[PDB]
Structure 1
């Protein structure tokens, strides 16, 4: 009557089979070494934990080569419109030097297909950042959400663009990300993509609507979203094409590495790379633990 399931991603190997593992150099120039599925499994970076799907980074070995070992999974299936609901028992922590992201990326050359960052942050961030990335000609309005809008222009390369490289809204619940989020047993992030805009809701563990995990979720009746990206300043239908789901954790790089020295992690090491290379144990909390990932369509 409102939305129907188009994909339940399951768990474990069945879940992994639905993604391609990216092993190229990090597009955001981080100190990371994205490894293949076989290598990741051999290093304990992916697996199943009591029925939940685990995706993490190397928190054992001093790093070498391209950087600290991690994985970047990109879905084989793509969606032009729909509702993506992820129930997470855990997400990468608020760890200095890290830059985790659960997001979507359109087809074609970046940023022409658009991109939607659902869960994202850097270093010791407390609040989740929800950010879109588009080509020029896409700005957002100020209403319909509970978060704090930080940037209004989604064009990645706009004139005085923020380090978030897009139009971002910051959550106001400190349990929306990292440490706080893990401390409460996680929660659910629901993202709706329509021809008129994108909305993202965050439900801390136990507060989610009774229909968000079922077979007919209906966002029209949910409380105000944490972020809403809409308005006449953007062609929402044309700026985003078929999106693939992505899980990753990179380190340092364009955002985390560039703001390292001016933030709360500055005293940990002269620069981000030194820290990530020499302190493997610092990254134990940098993992995703999925209860369920389901995509729906109207």
Structure 2
């Protein structure tokens, strides 16, 4: 009894019933128009596809107003310590101008409750980024994971790191994100939060352990995590509080929009906004397809 199930999200409407739909202007300043559940359902942005829960974006109409239509779901329930396991058949692709993310956010004013980016990236990225964003006074050790450490200071305004880079670790598997991830039918991302740290495992389709989807997973016997955040350089218990789960896909903005001109999407249009507004068909691959989402507690 290392871990026991405390919250199974099910699928379809039962799944959406466990989330609040965020409709405010995008905090990351993207060219996105977050819509309500009713509007999303009416636009085909959410639903069920052969038993899997679907969440995508508008890939039909030229954009206007705040931006291209999408959804941002934040869980009603919160968890302080536990294991979050998501099994995906598909995630938003490596589409130019997009910025998808499956993550967790603490309670209170950001970043004081902590933030965990489990699946995140922008534009035509190949590798997934796993990152923590915290208040000042939190750095991680460089060992215990298979990914490549990019930044060690989790403080959102860490000196010497781009603003809000946080402490990030990049996966080494090309199938850990977008295009590659979808070509193999997805996989599973398991995230463990304890008073001693946070760990994130990525199991590409077919390589998951026998208990990962069961009622009593035991991360202790799993292969090395893709990312591990720990060490005496952080008060792990105090830096993170009750976390809510979030699904979203924004466009351009602080990250995707800012790096548009230096990457491979630069040739698609002079600016990210122009591309996102005038090329609806380009975003057909920008959707999540969830097999299951289950949360466990020690």
The normalised TM-score by structure 1 is: 0.99
**Aligned positions, number:** 298
User: What is the alpha-carbon root mean square deviation over aligned residues?
Assistant: 0.7
Q: Which moved more, 1:262-271 or 1:82-91?
A: 262-271
Instruction: Note if contact 1:54-1:288 (Cα within 8 Å) is conserved in structure 2.
Output: yes
Q: CA deviation at 1:160?
A: 2.5
- Matching residue of 2:85: 85
Q: CA deviation at 1:163?
A: 6.0
Q: CA deviation at 1:170?
A: 0.2
Unaligned runs of 5+ in 1: none
Instruction: Note if contact 1:163-1:255 (Cα within 8 Å) is conserved in structure 2.
Output: no
Q: CA deviation at 1:18?
A: 0.1
Q: Distance in 2 between the 1:37 and 1:159 partners?
A: 40
Q: Secondary structure at the match of 1:249?
A: strand
Q: Distance in 2 between the 1:236 and 1:254 partners?
A: 27
Q: Distance in 1 between the 2:198 and 2:32 partners?
A: 30
Q: Secondary structure at the match of 2:142?
A: coil
Unaligned runs of 5+ in 2: none
1:172 aligns with 2:167: no
Q: CA deviation at 1:98?
A: 0.3
Instruction: Note if contact 1:138-1:233 (Cα within 8 Å) is conserved in structure 2.
Output: yes
Q: Secondary structure at the match of 2:169?
A: strand
Q: Which deviations, in whole Å up to 9, do the C-alpha atoms of 1:73-100 show, x marking residues without a partner?
A: 0000000000000000000000000000
Instruction: Note if contact 1:164-1:255 (Cα within 8 Å) is conserved in structure 2.
Output: no
Q: Distance in 2 between the 1:114 and 1:58 partners?
A: 31
Instruction: Note if contact 1:151-1:162 (Cα within 8 Å) is conserved in structure 2.
Output: no
Q: CA deviation at 1:159?
A: 2.1
Q: Distance in 2 between the 1:174 and 1:289 partners?
A: 19
Equivalences for residues 226-237 of structure 1 within 5 A: 226-237=226-237
Q: CA deviation at 1:164?
A: 5.9
Q: Secondary structure at the match of 1:169?
A: strand
The normalised TM-score by structure 2 is: 0.99
Instruction: Note if contact 1:131-1:164 (Cα within 8 Å) is conserved in structure 2.
Output: no
Q: Secondary structure at the match of 1:118?
A: strand
Q: Secondary structure at the match of 2:238?
A: coil
Q: Which deviations, in whole Å up to 9, do the C-alpha atoms of 1:240-286 show, x marking residues without a partner?
A: 00000000000000000000111111111101100100000000000
Instruction: Note if contact 1:68-1:277 (Cα within 8 Å) is conserved in structure 2.
Output: yes
Q: Secondary structure at the match of 1:154?
A: coil
Q: Distance in 1 between the 2:134 and 2:202 partners?
A: 23
Q: CA deviation at 1:165?
A: 2.0
Q: CA deviation at 1:158?
A: 1.5
